[PDB]
């Protein structure tokens, strides 16, 4: 249960519920089946929340890692329809769980800010500066490796 | 002092070839050549008594005690090591090894060596927690001192055995490489070396991590030693890279041999898919950023809805960086990892670098031309 | 003994001056040989300010590594003596007299740790060259090698800067037939800095480039660091883009 | 001696732990190295001794001082790692000898042997020409190549003798119970031209 969420990979509720259903509910604590908070009967009240959490997490990882994905691919993972996802998207962004913009076409999800001149500008400076720091550092290591004891 | 020659003398007359080793020992102890006497005991245990004879251990107990200051701390360990191999019971060998150890003038690592010998016994018995613990402590002690030659070589090979038995691919790969720099032959048969090449080559295939394919060739261990099991291995290393689930499903016999694969069969048929991505992205990305995703899925020979999953995992760890854009069904790679210790790549970067050098010079003349008055 | 306690290294004009003089002073022992001195200065400070240096006899072979002579006596007598005058200044380490970092250096360093409470490797490139600085700072780091033997001693670079007390700066101007060189200042200086940057960049790229030729043929090792650096250049693909101009300058002169 | 700079080279070997000298070689050599130093000081107060180790890679232990203390403390320590690294011992010594706090004195190397000398004839002969040109003599105390080995050393010592008034000496000490001091056989306590 810990290992799946920690590794950022795309998943879906449909598989997640069935599997964990057998593990968590069965799990011997001190010794009994009971542990609650998404395991047993009482645990079911908390479990409902777990579904919502999978869908906030799927949209988050895809947002961070990718910059564009289609809305049809996104829905399959979340286990929503487009009309259902769209409602959910309006409230998520307001709390600031994620930043994402979805359309009605289901052509695309822009997980970046729209292509305005400032983002392009910003990246272009950062790319330049990193190279210059790296070329300096490598020359210092290289100098020892070359000369050495002067046995070669 | 001389309680021990009295016993050697008696024994001296018997044994077919053991007689000779005995004659030398007595002559050297009287001269009081302490260096030469210690060097004779070493030879003595290995071919004679306790293989051809019996009762080397008993003779040894007497021998180390009194003679302790005439023998050196490293050596005492070495004599005991050979007999222990020969001992049929590891239990009785463990009893001796702990008690025997001592240290006098000319201070050394002798405690640590004696520990390696104990760790080897724990493997023989085959209780995994016990072997794991001995390996950790002794390793730490060995690792701090740079001085370790012989001891490191036998110990790393022993640990190597434990990591493939438990069945963990990552542990074996890191361990194997240290064994390669520290190598020696004290009592390292041809057989052990071959097991090491074969397991190492396989280790790189089992993980879902780093691409190890180019480097495997470079490393002397596999390259120097050959057999037909490994003849199968070389083909297999670039069978996942092209993407073939067939050039390893009939060379599939290699895994059967090792116990290393024991839950890395659930990582074998994940690695193939990462490798299909690794090949195309390495060549085409660099010059121009984007590449199609359609070629990589078909090479995988596994569906589209599960290839994305591994590829996302690869972006996450940082093995590769970039995005999957499903609006056009192509993969845009920002950065690609350069596979390490490949000769071809060095040639490739050199010619590029020279073009950059030109560019700097060309530009520099222009900047000075205008604003030269201001520059002075 | 402390070498790891230095992030940043600052040198007074004095040390750069002092080293060139010592080279002659020993009785003109050079060529293959080098001259070393003590560095006196601070420690237990993240900033290392090397206050002074004084001459030490030294014969170096840097083509061998099983012979060197290092004067034992000077280090000890000098550390014992100095406490009364300055309790902070202790023997900070030793300067090497170019042309670049050697593996030949670890060996000499080791001795210096024993004798002296601290050591540091400051490499001053040979006899006076350059407009800018010729000193690089290195601290001996202990690392594991995952292919050889853990605990190897090697040198990692640390940032080199300069810095000195007020009285000393005032002295430099008096002696000297100008004040200092470029690093950034006036309108003229910024543009020079740009041209200074290009000749400087070019030097770094030659080191890598000559190395690759040597690794490919002549079999110098293949390290992951060298290869990582080269690949990134192709990948990042920088794209020229708009902005940064202004027209204000004319109105101001008109008003005046 | 009177106005001599001397570097004693210390042997620390797996043949120094030995018990050929009774009760132990370590001790017997320890009495020898102290005597050599006390004698030079008693001889001239201006005389100085220095320390370098032959064994392993080169460490300059002390540059020129009167101290018997430095040479004593080193001796207690044993080195299983390194024995006689002769070729190198001469080279560090020659260099070291030059810088002095008893300036414009004669140049001398005393090396103690007490282990079989690994170095072959080609190293040895080569070393003799370097010694002539710099005009430094080397003295050998030989209990290290009678113990299980033939003496390579004699020809070299003989040739080296008479390059100045403080010539070379081959000092003969037995291998078996007789200590590392039998200094009576040839001068080394102070310089002499003869062998």
UniProtKB/Swiss-Prot annotation, chain B:
N6-acetyllysine sites (modified residues): 298
Record domain PCI: where: 171-338
Top-level taxon: Eukaryota
Single GO MF annotation: structural molecule activity
Keywords noted in UniProt: Acetylation, Proteasome
GO biological process: meiosis I; ubiquitin-dependent protein catabolic process
Keyword hit for Acetylation: yes
Cellular component GO terms held in the UniProt record: cytosol; nucleus; proteasome accessory complex; proteasome complex; proteasome regulatory particle; proteasome regulatory particle, lid subcomplex
Quaternary structure annotation from Swiss-Prot or TrEMBL: Component of the 19S proteasome regulatory particle complex. The 26S proteasome consists of a 20S core particle (CP) and two 19S regulatory subunits (RP). The regulatory particle is made of a lid composed of 9 subunits including PSMD13, a base containing 6 ATPases and few additional components.
Role according to the record: Component of the 26S proteasome, a multiprotein complex involved in the ATP-dependent degradation of ubiquitinated proteins. This complex plays a key role in the maintenance of protein homeostasis by removing misfolded or damaged proteins, which could impair cellular functions, and by removing proteins whose functions are no longer required. Therefore, the proteasome participates in numerous cellular processes, including cell cycle progression, apoptosis, or DNA damage repair.
The family this protein is said to belong to: Belongs to the proteasome subunit S11 family.
Protein name: 26S proteasome non-ATPase regulatory subunit 13
Gene: Psmd13
């Amino acid at each position: 249960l810990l290992k799946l969420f920690t590794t950022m990979e795309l998943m879906r509720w449909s598989t997640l519920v069935e599997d964990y259903g057998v593990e968590l509910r069965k799990g011997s604590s001190e010794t009994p089946a009971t542990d609650v908070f998404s395991s047993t009967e009482e645990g079911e009240k908390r479990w409902k929340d777990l579904k919502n959490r999978v869908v906030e997490h799927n949209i988050r990882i895809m947002a961070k890692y990718y910059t564009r994905i289609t809305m049809k691919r996104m829905a399959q993972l979340l286990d929503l329809s487009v009309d259902e996802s769209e409602a959910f998207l309006s409230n998520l962004v307001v709390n600031k769980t994620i930043f994402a913009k979805v359309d009605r076409l289901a052509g695309v999800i822009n997980f970046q800010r729209p292509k305005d001149p400032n983002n392009l500008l910003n990246d272009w400076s950062q790319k330049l500066n990193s190279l210059m720091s790296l070329v300096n550092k490598t020359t210092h290591l290289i100098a020892k490796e070359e000369m050495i004891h002067n046995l070669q | 002092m001389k309680d021990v020659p009295a016993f050697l003398q008696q024994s001296q007359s018997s044994g077919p070839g053991q007689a000779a080793v005995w004659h030398r020992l007595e002559e050297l102890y009287t001269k009081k050549l302490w260096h030469q006497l210690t060097l004779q005991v070493l030879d003595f245990v290995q071919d004679p008594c306790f293989a051809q004879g019996d009762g080397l251990i008993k003779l040894y107990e007497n021998f180390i005690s009194e003679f302790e200051h005439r023998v050196n701390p490293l050596s005492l360990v070495e004599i005991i090591l050979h007999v222990v191999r020969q001992m049929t019971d590891p239990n009785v060998a463990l009893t001796f090894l702990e008690k025997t150890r001592e240290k006098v003038k000319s201070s050394d690592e002798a405690v640590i060596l004696c520990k390696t010998a104990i760790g080897a016994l724990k493997l023989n018995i085959g209780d995994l927690q016990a072997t794991k613990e001995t390996i950790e402590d002794v390793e730490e002690m060995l690792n701090n001192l740079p001085g370790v030659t012989s001891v490191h070589s036998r110990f790393y090979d022993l640990s190597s055995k434990y990591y493939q038995t438990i069945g963990n691919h990552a542990s074996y790969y890191k361990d194997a490489l240290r064994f390669l720099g520290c190598v020696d032959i004290k009592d390292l048969p041809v057989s052990e070396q071959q097991e090491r090449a074969f397991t190492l080559g396989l280790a790189g295939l089992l993980g879902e991590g780093v691409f190890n394919f180019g480097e495997l060739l470079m490393h002397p261990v596999l390259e120097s030693l050959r057999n037909t099991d490994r003849q199968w291995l070389i083909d297999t290393l670039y069978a996942f890279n092209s993407g073939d689930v067939d050039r390893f499903q009939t060379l599939k016999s290699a895994w059967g041999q090792q116990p290393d694969l024991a839950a890395n069969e659930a990582q074998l048929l994940r690695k193939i898919q990462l490798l299909c991505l690794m090949e195309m992205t390495f060549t085409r990305p660099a010059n121009h950023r984007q590449l199609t995703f359609e070629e990589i899925a078909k090479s995988a020979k596994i569906t589209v809805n599960k290839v994305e999953l591994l590829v996302m995992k690869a972006l996450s760890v940082g093995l590769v960086r970039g995005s999957i854009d499903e609006v056009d069904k192509r993969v845009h790679m920002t950065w690609v990892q350069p596979r390490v210790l490949d000769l071809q790549q060095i040639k490739g970067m050199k010619d590029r670098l020279e073009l950059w050098c030109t560019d700097v010079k060309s530009m520099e003349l222009l900047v000075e031309h205008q604003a030269q008055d201001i520059l002075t | 003994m402390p070498e790891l306690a230095v992030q940043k290294v600052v040198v007074h004009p004095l040390v750069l001056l002092s080293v060139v003089d010592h080279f002659n002073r020993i009785g003109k022992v050079g060529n293959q040989k080098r001259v070393v001195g003590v560095l006196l200065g601070s420690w237990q400070k993240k900033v290392l300010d090397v206050s002074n240096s004084f001459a030490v006899p030294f014969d170096e072979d840097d083509k061998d590594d099983s012979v060197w002579f290092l004067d034992h006596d000077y280090l000890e007598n000098m550390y014992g003596m100095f406490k009364k005058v300055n309790a902070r200044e202790r023997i900070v380490g030793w300067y090497h007299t170019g042309p670049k970092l050697h593996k030949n250096d670890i060996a000499i360093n080791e001795l210096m740790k024993r004798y002296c409470p601290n050591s540091v490797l400051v490499i001053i490139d040979v006899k006076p060259k350059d407009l800018g600085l010729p000193t690089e700072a290195y601290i001996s780091v202990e690392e594991v090698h995952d292919d050889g033997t853990p605990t190897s001693k090697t040198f990692e670079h640390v940032t080199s800067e300069i810095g000195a007390e007020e009285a000393e700066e005032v002295g430099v101007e008096h002696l000297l037939r100008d004040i200092k060189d470029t690093t950034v200042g006036t309108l003229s200086q910024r543009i020079t800095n740009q041209v200074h940057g290009l000749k400087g960049l070019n030097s770094k790229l030659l080191d890598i480039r000559t190395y690759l030729e040597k690794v490919a043929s002549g079999k110098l090792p293949i390290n992951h660091h060298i290869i990582y650096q080269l690949q990134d250049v192709f990948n990042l693909l920088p794209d020229a883009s708009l902005q940064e101009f202004v027209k204000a300058f004319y109105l101001k002169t008109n008003d005046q | 001696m009177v106005l001599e700079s001397t570097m004693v080279c210390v042997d620390n070997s797996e043949y120094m732990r030995n018990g050929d000298f009774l009760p132990t070689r370590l001790q017997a050599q320890q009495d020898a190295v102290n005597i050599v130093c006390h004698s030079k000081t008693r001889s001239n107060p201006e005389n100085n001794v220095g320390l370098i180790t032959l064994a392993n890679d080169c460490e300059v232990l002390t540059t020129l001082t009167p101290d018997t203390g430095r040479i004593l403390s080193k001796l207690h320590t044993v080195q299983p790692k390194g024995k006689i690294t002769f070729c190198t011992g001469i080279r560090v010594a020659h260099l070291a000898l030059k810088h002095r706090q008893g300036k414009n004195h004669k140049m001398r190397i005393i090396a103690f042997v007490g282990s079989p000398v690994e170095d072959n004839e080609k190293d040895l002969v080569k070393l003799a020409k370097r010694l002539k040109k710099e005009k430094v003599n080397v003295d050998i105390i030989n209990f290290g190549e009678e113990e299980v080995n033939t003496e390579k050393l004699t020809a070299f010592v003989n040739t080296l003798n008479g390059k100045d008034g403080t010539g070379s000496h081959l000092v003969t000490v037995p291998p078996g119970p007789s200590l590392a001091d039998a200094l009576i056989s040839s001068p080394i306590l102070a310089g002499e031209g003869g062998a």
